[PDB]
Design an enzyme around this catalytic site. Structure first.
Site, short mmCIF file in Angstrom:
data_model
loop_
_atom_site.label_atom_id
_atom_site.label_comp_id
_atom_site.label_asym_id
_atom_site.label_seq_id
_atom_site.Cartn_x
_atom_site.Cartn_y
_atom_site.Cartn_z
N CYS A 111 0.89 -1.31 0.07
CA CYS A 111 0.05 0.01 -0.06
C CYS A 111 0.96 1.28 0.18
CB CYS A 111 -1.18 -0.04 1.00
SG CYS A 111 -0.71 -0.64 2.81
N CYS A 170 0.33 3.76 2.88
CA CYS A 170 1.04 2.87 4.17
C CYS A 170 2.57 2.73 4.25
CB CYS A 170 0.27 1.61 4.36
SG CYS A 170 0.91 0.02 3.45
#
Length: 105
Positions: free
Chosen positions: A29, A32
């Site tokens: 991600c 992230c």
């Protein structure tokens, strides 16, 4: 404090009678990958007032699925097995520590 954990220990963390920050990131991600290093300073900044317990979300389907935890980066704050608050997306420290202040206070 606590540190990185896996599925069967997610539970054994979140059951605890103190602020368990469960730090949901994943191996792909984009945001992230940028929040994880922000969440390293967010570990350090109060490192023993709170558990921080980081994990790759996909490895722990248990209770992840229940709380809609596909929105990673995600940050649940638990104690006693109860999630008191849940934050999502790349919040800056000044928003995260403000929203989360209701366990850092």
């Amino acid at each position: 404090a606590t540190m990185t954990l896996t599925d069967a220990n997610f539970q054994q963390a979140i059951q605890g009678d103190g602020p368990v920050l469960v730090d949901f990131w994943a191996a792909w991600c984009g945001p992230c990958r940028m929040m994880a290093p922000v969440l390293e300073e967010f570990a350090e900044a109060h490192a023993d007032k709170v558990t921080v317990a980081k994990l790759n979300v996909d490895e722990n389907p248990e209770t992840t699925s229940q709380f809609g935890i596909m929105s990673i980066p995600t940050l649940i704050l638990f104690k006693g097995g109860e999630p008191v608050k849940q934050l999502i997306g790349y919040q800056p420290k000044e928003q995260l520590e403000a929203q989360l202040a209701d366990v850092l206070q």
